[PDB]
Symmetry: D3
Subunit: 322 residues, 6 copies
């Protein structure tokens, strides 16, 4: 227990920092990318999978750039199925179709979005990043890539891809548009949180041990990666503090949370030193839609693990009967 | 690369140490346990799973003691399905049914054996250990529990459970007895290795980064857990070296390997410092059945990860067409 | 200094948690063990020791189970001598008679109680544990062994052994029953603290850097072993929090301290990260008999070392003239 | 001393691996970049420096891309001065002009080349990278950026910049073109080694504890950064080993060493676990020009530090009289 | 961020602890060492340096003991130059003349004082320590050497050397006595702070991430070296706490700060776990001369690095107008 | 197992390096210190000890310098008792009389020599060092204090004290001069080894996990303290290697072993990374007296612990009947 006590976490609502053009920045970003056709493509693949049909996905994300993914459809009688759009943790990528059997086995179509330029840490990826011309001086990793200007910042592109991933999922014929869920843990959680504010198609949010929240506090509290990439950039570029946090404010899950309206299930580990509880609760507490949080007092970044998976299935079942 | 060079690993066949009553010890152990009825129980669960039927399993292992498990049956047309009996890594247990969706998704019935007394490190378990009266002085963990005599040693009970697990799998009506696979990684690999020598019902072996192999070398090469448990016991009980290694000779994967006849797919990570390559290759090189090994030169204990899973599915498909 | 400041530690009295049947549970436990005869046996040994007479000890602890120990009697004229009953730290055991020369050299008979099932970490032991039938899923070690029910919990048996050890010591003819001291550091301290509440024969308590105190707080403050064994168990068995802490409440030093009446000398190290200062002071502050504490502000788990030994001799000398 | 003994290091000449088109790739790379004008720009700075004039440098490196640097010209009577082209270690950048006072103080003009896209670890930088369209999946850092094809690989661009840096230095009117030295430690040493083979203008090489050498061995020997970035990429992309090492063969200091003709002073620390001695000696031993090496047996990656600085000044003084 | 929040650091003025004979102890220490003649010697070196003239220095510090140093003089037309007296961090020594090119390059003469008995960790040294007869039981290092009595304590001799270093620098003919700066980081900073109180010749102080401050707090907040040397000594010698802290009170930068009058530029890293911010601010906040501090919130012990070097050049230029 | 295999350790006899004046250096050193009177003073202490009489010792060691110690005389009828002269490990000191109760309890007088200038790491000391005028530049600790000249080196003074300790012990009336044993572990072991060569009064050697042996190899094999102090000194003073090892040659246990004639019991831990096995075996294999070694294959620097204590008592008992 290195963070605020739980009684204080439950009330923690730090003063939010955002620029006055926060919304306009996102409106312009999405409008510019909507000018390119989504051109979603689903290509059935040869697989040893027997209970699921697997498709190679391609769609246009940020600025028409082609993003890969998987679509896993469980072999069931129902003509329309509910659907989970799944975002991936830091240094991960879409891997193989059989890496994502959980939701299909629970009777949900699952759209897994590959993460541009990552896919080399713990699971392979196939989607490149495409920068806005020059790739500035940065610290190793993604956290500081383009960080001196929100228009060039890496997560501008990722978030836009993620919003478009929902539209691509929605274009698949047996996807029930009334039951599209956006889901992620860690980086995936932070991507999902941004999507829960920017997407018009998402109906529910699953958001575990979210990353990309309350940056200024994160960097103060922990010296773990990936948040430490920002700290290390700041150690060297000592004249850039104000600029760095200005940029980051446009991508902070706390600011997106204040705008999200769809129902949400959060989870948090009180001993999580990768995504500290105070950063997660800051997001949760500002989250503007109907919400619940599962608190795992003795867990680190693993969170509630399989226990939380059970909670997520129960939560959605109940949500989509009401 | 801390271990022997790959060219030497491929030829590494250290002199084996075993007592003259190795086989008789195992014959008696099995014969005594076979006097208790197996009494396999399969109970269908209420589950949110939609593509798989899940059953709560109970069967009689070592000395009639009741061992838990899961049976996952994928919802397919075929009357008889092939079957994977899955053993679990150190500190793990059967967890939830949805923790084992891989093989069922590939059209295999999957029998997951819970590990007696463990289930508290990374995945919950539900089966206790039942010792042979007194529980001798030991180092924390399972590696030294009862280690001063093979009759009292922990893995005598686990291995017997494991052989009985194959019988329990085989009792299920939808299981094709010609395609029963025994499978495990790490501790699971070592269990499966023992079962490949002791079971009459097993048709194929999947054995990843196996643990419980070449104890004397393991303990001299690495200071990682769980092999360090043995080392720390020896640090204190300095008068017990000979007895400890005598006991471990009855449970060493290399000695079982020299007796196994069924086809096997092994995997090994050359930078694995939990199960060092020399111990894995010792087991592989002595393995007496038709065999292949996948070598992952840059991997630590994670081995081939999902790459190896692809290899396993390809390997069994080809095997069961011949 | 990671824990509360000294001024706050001196007043720290957190709300105690215990079940209504605390006392009854212990009354029954001891009554049930008293139905077996103590049958204490003292067997003089061949030894190179010249200033001390060494005896192999055996006595009946929990439920008649046979516990080992040593009795060390200094060669002195006096026909009745004072006596220290010594309990042992985690992963320790009775070792050799020459591992316990301090108190005999100070003119005290010393009864060293071996610890059931341990003796494999830093000093050898010879006493097994005997469990209550099934040995449940647990994390490696003794902290979580039987932890889902106070009737099955490991320390129920250790504490009962320890109460019976004082009776065994008292049965030795040369022991002055008016000057029997119970003593321990770390785990030994926690055991001695339990004995100070449950024994009728103990006349003074020496309690250094005690372990088994204020579990809830211990587990939140430090990630060191052995308290981390509980945290790790909780990380996995996420549905078992309330049951775990309910069990531990019956064995908590704080709850025993509130019942102990005999005079006591405690010690604490303010930088001790194995047994945190707040857990030790919680115990000391609730301790209901006449008491003193020696505070070592710069020491970690070693506490006052040999300096504290000097204080203990001086404390008992003065106590037993008064 | 974790590497080969010194007697063996002195003889270590592993078999070299390079593609048949090695020279051809470099010839085309340079020829394509030479079609863009160098357009060197030196702009005198307002500075508090009093013994040295400082210039802001800009020149065209790889494919006309604008690279920053500093030029430090010590205030001396001589019309033409000798000149050191300085390359910078991993995660470093050109920093401030006063970060490079050594060579000017010794009477050499110093040209410090900023490193594209780095400058965020231990010294700031101002020069971006400009990738060849898509920036593929990569591990955090620069070592795997574009690694699936030598045409897209990061170091192709760095090396081309570095060759052009020497031409930009040569264009400064006060530079004696007969006494242009190329210099670097670690990454800088590796860049310098490449330039010693590719540049026609360099007259001498200073190469300390070089990085970018004998990749295959580096990655097998040490788990330190930055070589571990390659290992980690390999751990995930298990199907990409052959391609990765193919690509890296075009950038390996050992293969450049075999082609360099200018005189060289190397240094090596025998306890260096960032740049292992065997990788350094492999480069040194294949180095085809007149050469010397200073061996620091007890030093890790810091090498000879200031002692080596003295050696370099003596080395060049003697070289440029002789 | 392990220490007090920045808002509390800016107000942190812990009650100071010093003995009533603090000043007399220092007055006597200096008076006794002033009885030996400074006898400064500057010996021109053969060097490959071309823009600087380098001299081997020797002068008499504590009790006439001969301390080594370097004097680096930039080759400039001006007949009088300003001067920086540079003190060295823990386990360092005077090294080579080319290890100190910064200030000379900025037009300042630079006097680098070698540190008695150290010079074996990250940069070579050539000056021995000469102890007061017996070298008491101590923990490895310099922090507890002679710690049981201020008169025998290692830093008494280092501080005395340091004060005399300024007199040595001042004796060089080109040195402008009106523009003598004392400078250090870490251990150097702590030495410089001491000299700022004890020297009559120093005109300005540069003090980065200073060490030797607020010992009682230092030892309770971090377990890093070198403060952990004291903690470890105390772990063993458990009967010696009061004596140890009494001795350290005579060498604590916070007590010297309360006495310094010369203008000062401080720097601090808020993530510094070698010299914790609360110890640095304690010294800055009690500092009695005109003062500024540069705060680097995201830096550990490296502080402002080259950024701070820029600040220091700007600060002095403005000060000496 | 990081060091040479056991079969090679048993034959390891590396070429010895020593100066031609080795013997003369020691002859002179001892002759000069013998010109001061030993002036041994035993002063009976008030103690709580009841089975042992404790004396405060003071004697003249190196150059008449006054060294403290303890003398512990067990209360026995015998008029003459055998005697153990005990030397202390690095950063230790004489501590309290009750810190050394083992040998008196076994019926031996025990003379504990305090270590000049240490006494501040793990046990308090009371004896200063008194250097030969100037205390040269050094790395923190004792290993490099005065290292640039054998005449100023710290261990010259310690070894001379240690030889004088035996004379001091001999002067006590109840000491049987025919049964004086010199004993130490680690630093104590290296001191004892020196004394076994230099003392004329010593009758047997107990030498555990000895330190101060085969320095050149120690420093190349391990990075642990205290050997690492030398390595660090060398990292900075890069021009001093030859001098440093010249000096250390006069203090190397291997060179003393080659001269010792008294019977000796050694011990060694094969996983000891503070005093590596190859250094210990080098000393043991060159040891010129009758000898035995107890090998503890699985132990670290703790060696045989209490088991070795048993061995030492049995060894001496047998030796002093023969
Ligand atoms: Ca707006
Ligand atoms: Ca496709
Ligand atoms: Ca047989
Ligand atoms: Ca009650
Ligand atoms: Ca017996
Ligand atoms: Ca060619
Ligand atoms: Ca006064
Ligand atoms: Ca001779
Ligand atoms: Cl993540
Ligand atoms: Cl495992
Ligand atoms: Cl304990
Ligand atoms: Cl580098
Ligand atoms: Cl420092
Ligand atoms: Cl030692």
């Amino acid at each position: 227990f290195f963070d605020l006590p739980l009684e204080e976490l439950k009330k923690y609502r730090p003063e939010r920092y955002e620029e006055k053009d926060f919304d306009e920045f996102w409106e312009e970003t999405l409008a510019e990318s909507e000018k390119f056709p989504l051109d979603p493509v689903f290509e059935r693949m040869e697989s040893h999978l027997k209970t699921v049909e697997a498709y190679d996905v391609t769609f246009s994300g940020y600025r028409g750039q082609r993003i890969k993914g998987w679509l896993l459809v469980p072999k069931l009688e129902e003509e329309k199925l509910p659907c989970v759009v799944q975002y991936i943790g830091y240094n991960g990528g879409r891997g193989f179709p059989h890496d994502w059997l959980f939701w299909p086995s629970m009777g949900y179509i699952c759209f897994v979005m590959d993460t541009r330029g990552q896919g080399s840490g713990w699971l392979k990826g196939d989607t490149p990043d495409y920068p806005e011309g020059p790739v500035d001086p940065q610290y190793p990793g993604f956290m500081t890539r383009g960080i001196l200007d929100p228009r060039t910042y890496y997560y501008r592109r990722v978030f836009t891809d993620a919003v478009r991933a929902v539209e691509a999922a929605a274009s698949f014929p047996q996807v029930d548009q009334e039951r599209i869920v956006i889901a992620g843990g860690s980086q995936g959680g932070g991507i999902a949180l941004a999507v829960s504010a920017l997407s018009k198609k998402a109906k529910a949010l699953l958001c575990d041990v979210p990353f990309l929240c309350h940056f200024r506090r994160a960097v103060q509290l922990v010296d773990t990666h990936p948040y430490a990439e920002i700290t290390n950039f700041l150690k060297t570029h000592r004249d850039k503090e104000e600029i760095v946090f200005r940029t980051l404010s446009y991508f902070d899950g706390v600011n997106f949370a204040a705008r999200a309206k769809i129902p949400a299930l959060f989870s948090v580990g009180l001993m999580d030193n990768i995504c500290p509880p105070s950063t997660v609760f800051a997001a949760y507490n500002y989250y503007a839609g109907p919400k619940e949080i599962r608190i795992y007092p003795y867990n680190n970044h693993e969170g509630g693990g399989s226990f939380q998976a059970v909670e997520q299935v129960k939560f959605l079942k109940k949500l989509f009967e009401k």
